[PDB]
Amino acid sequence: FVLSVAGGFVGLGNVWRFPYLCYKNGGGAFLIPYFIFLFGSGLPVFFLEIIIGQYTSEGGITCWEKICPLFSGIGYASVVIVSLLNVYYIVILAWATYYLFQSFQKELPWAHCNHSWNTPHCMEDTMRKNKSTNFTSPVIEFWERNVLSLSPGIDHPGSLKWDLALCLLLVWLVCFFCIWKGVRSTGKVVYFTATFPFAMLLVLLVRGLTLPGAGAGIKFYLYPDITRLEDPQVWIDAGTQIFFSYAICLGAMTSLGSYNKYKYNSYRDCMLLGCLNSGTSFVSGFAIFSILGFMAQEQGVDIADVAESGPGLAFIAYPKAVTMMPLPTFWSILFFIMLLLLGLDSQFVEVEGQITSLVDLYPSFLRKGYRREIFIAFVCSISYLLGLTMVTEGGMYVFQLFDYYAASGVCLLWVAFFECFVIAWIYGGDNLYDGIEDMIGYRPGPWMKYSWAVITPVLCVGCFIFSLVKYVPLTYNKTYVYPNWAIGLGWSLALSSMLCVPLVIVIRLCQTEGPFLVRVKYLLTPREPNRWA
């Protein structure tokens, strides 16, 4: 149906990122700011970007020049954000490829621990209750000592891991020869593409719900502990997860909406897609936390200490689940194929959009003087060389710093706040409503206007100031304290995109003649936003 063509309601942000962020922040208290942000700023900004693209019929950069020439740095900020995100979004795919290649033997490597990479502290999970120190689980030991080979800190990069580097090269070469060729989909594969992840998720959920101790996991996942709400990090993580999953503030939704017709009702579509995305994110937590509760019951420890409080939660939990099913290798192969399929489509779309946006800036020297293939190869090679920094023995710390500052946090709240503020208080909410009534056929209600003028601005500014007043530095797995220069580099990563609006404002102000007031009054006037008809 239209849902099959719509897709996007499933992604790695729903399967890999939401459960680990919910588990890190206690679980249950994460859901109040999550839903508050979802119904206060998530859907309205998505609809605003879609409608701006549809109205202007322009991409992510040229659309802001026809609405407010002064505030034209939002497109450059989005370009920088997407460029930073494309570097580290593919290490997850590299890990999935490594796991898939490792799951082709007669026995799964993480089922038992008697191998070369194990330690004397390891014991089988089913025999821990017989005896009881510092004992460890075979699956965690596998993930930490065979795939990662963790070092004592970020300042100990150790040596490059050649198998992970080759997997990264393989996934980047898959991205190439497909972005270049242009093969995206057909009229027969989309039925299997959009149905396989849901079938796998249903199988995993059914398996998890029947395990002993699942009720404790559900209670942990659903009970809203209140005293955790005084920490700004819960609010920031819950708010930025919605932005990350919806792929807003990246310049992609504007381009997607630019392909719609002028007379098309996208309001109902933006609501359906958002609701389905949120529901898909919410459902898989049940399976994840039922598995976690079963593991806690089996090992005789707390649910808050069984697994990693970081990005490896899925790679620790899901293989444990597939080890409890008949024919485990078949299910492992299916699960990791599904993960790769989920990741590759988003990576393809994002890299293609970034390349198109970068080419559009210089159409003369990137279409005639230089071919597009050379530019694509250069971008891919630079991204691979940059991402080589996260496949060493101390690359997990570098990955955690880019997933906290590069494409989330204060940098995603800055862009959203400036978009909403510009639209609400310069162009005009009533003017935008008149346009929307012209296109979609009927006038919307007052929810979108108030979310653009009051709710989104207050939430963004309030969360930012709260974090600075009660400051707490970033940690890894609750125990690693990063050095000061690492925090400085992480903040520079966000500032590199945050500093795009004032600089463009200064350039525009200096590139005009006349009095200051005259200059400001001229760069604030929209320039024929809808020219078609």
Ligand X SMILES: CCCCCCCCCCCCCCCC
Ligand Y SMILES: CC(C)CCC[C@@H](C)[C@H]1CC[C@H]2[C@@H]3CC=C4C[C@@H](O)CC[C@]4(C)[C@H]3CC[C@]12C
Sites of contact with ligand X (CB under 6 A): 76, 79-80, 83-84, 101-102, 155, 157, 163, 166-167, 169-170, 361, 389, 398, 410, 413-414, 417, 460-461, 464, 496
Q: Which of 46, 76, 289, 336 binds ligand Y (CB under 6 A)?
A: 76
Q: Residue 18 CB, nearest distance to Cl ion (Å)?
A: 5
The DSSP output letter for 483 is P
Residues 6+ away with beta carbon under 8 Å from 154: 394, 397, 398, 401, 482, 483, 486
Q: Which of residues 184-203 bind ligand Y (CB under 6 A)?
A: none
Q: Which does 245 bind (CB under 5 to 8 A by kind): ligand Y, ligand X, Cl ion, none?
A: Cl ion
Q: Which stretch binds ligand Y (CB under 6 A): 8-16, 51-59, 244-252, 498-506?
A: 498-506
Based on the shown chain and the rule CB under 6 A, indicate whether residue 80 belongs to the binding site for ligand Y. Answer: yes
Q: Which of 149, 389, 496, 530 binds ligand Y (CB under 6 A)?
A: 496
Q: Residue 54 CB, nearest distance to ligand X (Å)?
A: 25
Q: Which does 414 bind (CB under 5 to 8 A by kind): Cl ion, ligand Y, ligand X, none?
A: ligand X
Most distant CA pair in the chain, distance: 84
Based on the shown chain and the rule CB under 6 A, indicate whether residue 270 belongs to the binding site for ligand Y. Answer: no
| Residue 532 CA from chain centroid, whole number | 35
Q: Residue 489 CB, nearest distance to ligand Y (Å)?
A: 12
Based on the shown chain and the rule CB under 6 A, indicate whether residue 85 belongs to the binding site for ligand Y. Answer: no
Q: Residue 392 CB, nearest distance to ligand X (Å)?
A: 9
Closer residue to Cl ion, CB minimum distance, 245 or 400: 245
CA-wise closest residue to 141 among 168, 180, 115: 115
Q: Residue 11 CB, nearest distance to Cl ion (Å)?
A: 9
Q: Residue 397 CB, nearest distance to ligand X (Å)?
A: 8
CA-wise closest residue to 179 among 401, 346, 12: 346
Q: Which does 281 bind (CB under 5 to 8 A by kind): ligand X, Cl ion, ligand Y, none?
A: Cl ion
Q: What distances in angstroms separate CA 207 from CA 68, 300, 383, 435, 510, one per listed residue?
A: 53, 21, 39, 50, 63
Q: Which does 157 bind (CB under 5 to 8 A by kind): ligand Y, ligand X, Cl ion, none?
A: ligand X
Closer residue to ligand X, CB minimum distance, 129 or 156: 156
Based on the shown chain and the rule CB under 6 A, indicate whether residue 499 belongs to the binding site for ligand Y. Answer: yes
Q: Residue 412 CB, nearest distance to ligand Y (Å)?
A: 17
Q: Are 460 and 413 in contact (CB under 8 A)?
A: yes
Q: Are 21 and 281 in contact (CB under 8 A)?
A: no
Q: Which of 169, 271, 503, 509 binds ligand Y (CB under 6 A)?
A: 503
Structure tokens at 406: 């590069």
Map residue 476 onto helix, strand or coil.
Answer: strand
Based on the shown chain and the rule CB under 6 A, indicate whether residue 507 belongs to the binding site for ligand Y. Answer: yes
Based on the shown chain and the rule CB under 6 A, indicate whether residue 504 belongs to the binding site for ligand Y. Answer: yes
Based on the shown chain and the rule CB under 6 A, indicate whether residue 145 belongs to the binding site for ligand Y. Answer: no
Based on the shown chain and the rule CB under 6 A, indicate whether residue 405 belongs to the binding site for ligand Y. Answer: no
Q: Which does 84 bind (CB under 5 to 8 A by kind): ligand X, ligand Y, Cl ion, none?
A: ligand X
Q: Which does 10 bind (CB under 5 to 8 A by kind): Cl ion, ligand Y, ligand X, none?
A: none
φ, ψ of residue 402 to 5 degrees: the values are: -80, -35
Residue with structure tokens 């580290």?
88
Q: Which does 507 bind (CB under 5 to 8 A by kind): ligand Y, ligand X, Cl ion, none?
A: ligand Y
CA-wise closest residue to 98 among 340, 281, 270: 340
Q: Residue 279 CB, nearest distance to ligand X (Å)?
A: 28
Based on the shown chain and the rule CB under 6 A, indicate whether residue 424 belongs to the binding site for ligand Y. Answer: no
Q: What distances in angstroms separate CA 352 from CA 153, 346, 479, one per listed residue?
A: 35, 10, 39
Map residue 251 onto helix, strand or coil.
Answer: coil
Long-range Cβ pairs for the range 453-459 (8 Å, 24+): 453/420, 453/424, 453/425, 453/429, 455/40, 455/41, 455/44, 456/40, 456/41, 456/44, 456/45, 456/416, 456/417, 456/420, 457/417, 457/420, 457/421, 457/424, 459/36, 459/37, 459/40, 459/41, 459/239
Beta-bridge mates of residue 392: 160
Q: Which does 169 bind (CB under 5 to 8 A by kind): ligand X, ligand Y, Cl ion, none?
A: ligand X
Q: Residue 86 CB, nearest distance to Cl ion (Å)?
A: 20
Q: Which does 499 bind (CB under 5 to 8 A by kind): ligand X, Cl ion, ligand Y, none?
A: ligand Y
Q: Which does 160 bind (CB under 5 to 8 A by kind): Cl ion, ligand Y, ligand X, none?
A: none
Q: Are 338 and 14 in contact (CB under 8 A)?
A: no
Distance CA(497)–CA(489), nearest Å, equals 13
Q: What distances in angstroms separate CA 335 from CA 26, 315, 340, 341, one per listed residue?
A: 27, 11, 9, 10
Closer residue to ligand X, CB minimum distance, 214 or 398: 398
Based on the shown chain and the rule CB under 6 A, indicate whether residue 406 belongs to the binding site for ligand Y. Answer: no
Q: Residue 340 CB, nearest distance to ligand Y (Å)?
A: 32
Closer residue to ligand Y, CB minimum distance, 382 or 507: 507
Q: Which does 101 bind (CB under 5 to 8 A by kind): ligand X, Cl ion, ligand Y, none?
A: ligand X
Q: Are 401 and 395 in contact (CB under 8 A)?
A: no
Residue with structure tokens 């990955």?
399
Give the interface with ligand Y as residue ranges (CB under 6 A). Answer: 76, 80, 496, 499-500, 503-504, 507-508
